[PDB]
Curated annotation (Swiss-Prot):
Purpose of the protein: Required for flagellar hook formation. May act as a scaffolding protein.
Species whose genome carries this gene: Salmonella typhimurium (strain LT2 / SGSC1412 / ATCC 700720)
Protein name: Basal-body rod modification protein FlgD
Keyword terms of this UniProt record: Bacterial flagellum biogenesis
Family: Belongs to the FlgD family.
Superkingdom as given in the UniProt entry: Bacteria
């Protein structure tokens, strides 16, 4: 209970592929995206990430590179392969390495112990790879 409860209000990286893109409501707001990650059981020589929009169109392919085993997180700049910035909305990442567990950002909204992640549903504490 103590360990679950102090996560409320923090972000967690959990299995999933979702990235959210958007702008703040303030003047001058630049598009930002919620972090993504990958868990590797073995170290990786090359790491590639493909990002699709809701229609499933590839808007960017990322070359991540060499990564040691374990948990890693990244933030996409929200720009397409042609330099333009993507509309506000949901995007999905697919990651392959040479098994890869993709990680997505979720906000902890409460507890039930189970973490309530809102839209993402629930997850147990052990499925949390990183707290932010």
């Amino acid at each position: 209970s103590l360990q679950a409860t102090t996560l409320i209000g923090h972000g967690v990286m959990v299995p999933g592929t979702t990235i959210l893109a958007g702008k703040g409501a303030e003047e001058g707001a630049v598009t930002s995206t919620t972090p993504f990650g990958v868990e590797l059981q073995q170290p990786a020589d090359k790491v590639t990430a493909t990002i699709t929009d809701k229609d499933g169109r590839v808007v960017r392919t990322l070359e991540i590179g060499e990564l040691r085993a374990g948990v890693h997180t990244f933030t996409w700049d929200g720009k397409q392969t042609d330099g333009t910035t993507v509309p506000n909305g949901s995007y999905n990442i697919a990651i392959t390495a040479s098994v890869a567990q993709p990680l997505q950002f979720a906000l902890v909204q409460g507890v039930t112990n189970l973490l309530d992640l809102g839209t993402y549903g629930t997850t147990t504490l052990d499925e949390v790879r990183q707290i932010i």
